[model samples]
Target: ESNFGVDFVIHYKVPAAERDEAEAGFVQLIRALTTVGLATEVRHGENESLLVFVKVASPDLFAKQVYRARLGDWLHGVRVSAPHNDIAQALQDEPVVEAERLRLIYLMITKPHNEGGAGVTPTNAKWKHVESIFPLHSHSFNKEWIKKWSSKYTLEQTDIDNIRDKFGESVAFYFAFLRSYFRFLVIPSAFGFGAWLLLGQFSYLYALLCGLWSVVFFEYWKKQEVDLAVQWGVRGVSSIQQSRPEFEWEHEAEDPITGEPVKVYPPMKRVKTQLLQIPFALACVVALGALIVTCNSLEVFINEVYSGPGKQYLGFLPTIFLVIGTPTISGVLMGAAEKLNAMENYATVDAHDAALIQKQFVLNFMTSYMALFFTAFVYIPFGHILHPFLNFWRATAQTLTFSEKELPTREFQINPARISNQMFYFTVTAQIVNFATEVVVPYIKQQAFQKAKQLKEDHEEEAEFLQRVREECTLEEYDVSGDYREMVMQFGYVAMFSVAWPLAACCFLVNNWVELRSDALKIAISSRRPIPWRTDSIGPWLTALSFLSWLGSITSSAIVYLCSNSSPLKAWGLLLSILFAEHFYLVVQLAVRFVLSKLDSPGLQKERKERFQTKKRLLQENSEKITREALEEEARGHGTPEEMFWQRQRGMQETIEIGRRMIEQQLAAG
Candidate 1:
């Protein structure tokens, strides 16, 4: 068993020329550690290097004990195990290596004063050679866990617990949310398919159902996210997070409530930075919107009017431009967004990530859906009005010469079925392509790269070269942002366009079944182990989903109102129909929320009850233990200062005799 209560070895390197300055910094660090109740053993490492082995004092173990108890509560849905309740056993139960233990200690030490840390920032310290604070992960253990998870028919909260234990809460919450969201989607998906077969596309009933489903899904997910956050013990976790080294302060002062030293920045400055996003978002909309409109106009003109030779070849231009230009424009925007985020000067990584995601979500939403927007709202409804304007190259002369009549705008009609066709292509074809690109292609590339690396290594003789190759293969960078982006885009596809094809939900449900497993495999095998980070929710994606839900109601209503009817409604009738549909959608959403809230899940009820009972048990046990200790102290005639004062004022005989009787009665009952 591991001893010394989790040792951490920190190796700091310095130049020989700066040895004196480094030594002084080391001494200061040691003094700081001692003040925080950490024992340190130092020695010479390699040339110009110092190795410090650190251990926490017994009192510091109190934090670890509480942490272990909470982890047990989260994992097993119970109090700490009997062995873990013992401090020595609790120390022994820690499964991390020395390097990982050091990493944990580093995190604690770097935290701000109010959060019970020394706040020794390595990056900001003059000892700049403190280059790395890496934690080691067990590849074999992770591989085995992945295998076990793969064999399961369906994942449970226990599986998420396992993930949290091995990886971190940040990663585990994502998978948990995915599983929970998928489960909720089943209701909407089933109903959607039923409506599709019975009422067909553009049916008012189908649109209503979809609109209600979107609203209900968004509301329910908000509740579900909170429940998971509570279960995982990461609710409002960002508050306790350490400040980023890059964060600058406007001033420093003591907190009025806690009386702790605080770094302050003007809220007005942050608000100003946020306001900058509006113009940036609008610019993105205009620039990208213009590009999309240009491409769309060209495609429509070629198909409908341009009787020029090789019209078929001209048709491919829009797709080719979109394929080439979208990524380029997106890259430029992303670079600008990064610069903007840096300018915003967020004090925390979470804040920075939230801002970046917000901007990216807007850019991505427009790029992905604007074309569809043009097709549904502008193309189908107002194509005739726009077609006459496409006679820039005198295509009207060709039309008049061929048919011996003036070009008629009313004769040009966009196919309403095009929306259904696009929906089909997106749900079925595009999804498969996305899966292959994200999972299959990357997997093949990784495998090929590994094989190539092995062959190259076989011909090499240098030990250092071989070591470098081994490290590179074993460790890779992992970012879950891409995963979030993929899910959000997938959601947009379903929510914004599902009215054109009610089967979209059914298709999405099928895709997600594969997606769940594929994503797990990708994370486990294709990527490096990510450093665990905590999050209370999916972050800004929740806001994006809510927005999509609201947009879905409007889009679905418009598509049904306009396309389902053969005759074009007059302006007043069209306005009334849209208003009525929107009102009905609002009513349905409210009803769904009320019903779902009242009919809470049995699992949620059980968990809540168990949590209440667990707290009660712990409270009772604590009270009993304190009472027993007091009685024992009275019997021994060793009273605290308050008790001694009470004894001086009143006779102790009655109190002692009463305590002895109570103890005797309790023992007899036991």
Candidate 2:
């Protein structure tokens, strides 16, 4: 007569075998168990299995019953039993060690005083069996693949290789496309022998084509990165630590209804470190500016002043030196920036990495912009104007005979087409050469180093000693040298080729397939396993791209004006156009982000709805069962009218308290 609210609520389909043999008997037994302070339920599962929910008076009793059930001795085997008798015996003999440990811990926390454990009771009236059914945490299927090799690789080489293998071919081709588009380098270079004869120095069609090339190449790469990220299984992986030990809160607020804690932190303290970015941005610009100016001046002097007889060959010397010096200077500033980022005292590793990358993006943009502009504007235009003026002035001072053609004139101004052509030539040729030097050259060096290390390990004597030496030797060998080379090569493509040609986009589109496959192969074959690094997007490069686009537009417009119209006013108008374009692009980006964020809201709402439904159903069932028990107790005491009234009132109070407790527990769980 004392039915405690036990019911089999199946959420999914049970296995045909279990369902056909035991469904009826199990329900009847669950009903019977309810009278003994235990509630039972059966849930359909993912596979052909049933999930049994057993609730008892206390965790200790629940644990004892579960233990007995597996041992084939629970309730004297009078109630319904599992069809597969061997299942329980097998579990008793060979239970999963970890699972058993967790179960014990859960049970210990909920057990009553008589069970020699904590007496903290579950909010649900049928708390006893609930502890036994608590599930263990499972591993994430998404990140499981990364576990295979992450421990095997060191961080530095792992970082380098992951970038290279992920970036190489498509990246290389991307640069090639930029070179062709920016300067019309490839088309002109391939067709230049003929075009040079037909179009000559300042061809209108060629300049227009080159401008179109640069714009299209930049736009296309943005999409290419998105596709590559998806293919590599790293689209939006954010490195969120499960829970941080160091995280401390200043104060907490509780919801009166839910009894859940809401943590808070001092906003003023957070703002202080955030302000450090302003100084960092300024420092990066200053440092990058100095490097760019120094490199630019040196290149100009070599090309103009030192271009005597064999100057064409010698001109490459400063260029080579600049190439070697840029990375060194960048490395030093990056180290300083990293120190500054550390000083910010971020609460999470993700925050630290983000701050570090943001500073790097600033430095890279400043450097790339200053370098590209120096070549596109000051070097080409000023050189053309000043070089002839100096010559003409010298001739006049020396009282030498000079014609109108020899002196500086309007015709001697820098041809915009020539500037565009030079831009394209340098980008394409340099990118290819950089790839070979960065990738192929380093590969051979790494292979040689690996061979030497392996030989040293082989020569060691004694099994134990040899094993130790081998482990030590393999530490450096396990880093991904090939991956590092690939990333550097891709960087070359992005930085140098973006302005080359419009058709460069199409070239990049095709090259991306080979690039993606090649990078994967390199990662599989050439590099050590990658460490698990979760990031939301490409690090720092986005900032560099934005800076480049702005700088490129200004540079392109200036070239178009100077070469096409030879008017000073045109240059100013072009600058304004470039500024307007930047603002428009930023606005578009903001609107898109807003829309996407709004779209994500519905998914979150759906999740919450499902959770609410489960809690509501559980509450209703518990309330109904408690009501029925009270009514039955009242009926039993009806002969003693006063006793019946008191019993009914006591039962009603208990039921109300139970409902409140259930709500509190559900809120706490969330």
lDDT scores for all predictions? Answer: 0.69, 0.44
lDDT of 2 by residue, 1-670 (tens): 1112321122222445545435654454354445444455543332343445444456555545455533432222211222234444544654423323333433443344443244334342433222122321112311332343244322233333333343332233333333323332334233333434465543334443433333444454444444344333233333222212235566777835336564444567668867877887787777777767665565555444432356588568656876687788788878888777665556554556556666766655565456655555565555554565345444542354433444322223344444455445444554456446544665677678667766781232344432322222222222232333333333333323333333333333333323433343333333332322333244444454555544444444454433433244455676675565445445544554465445534323443564576557688798568667766665662468675655634555776887898899989976
- Which 10 successive residues of model 2 have the least lDDT summed? 1-10
- Candidate 1 C-alpha lDDT tens digits along 1-670: 1222324445566677777787787787777777667787664444455556567776557456455534644453332223344455555675443333443666655555655456566666664666443333455665676677667767877888877765677777777767866776787688788877887677777767777777777787777776776565565666645467687787898977457787877889989987888889998898889889778776776676554567797689888999898888888988999988887878777988888999899888988788888878777766566655566424644554586555433235677777777788788998899889978887788778768766881243434433332342344556777777877787777666787787888888888777777777777666655656777788988888878877777777777666764256466766776787778878987888888788776446656776677678898788445556555545674557756654432435666787898899989976
Instruction: Report the C-alpha displacement of residue 367, candidate 1, in angstroms.
Output: 1.4
Task: Assess every candidate by TM-score.
Answer: 0.71, 0.47
Model 1 weakest lDDT span, ten residues long: 1-10
Q: Which is the leading candidate under TM-score?
A: 1
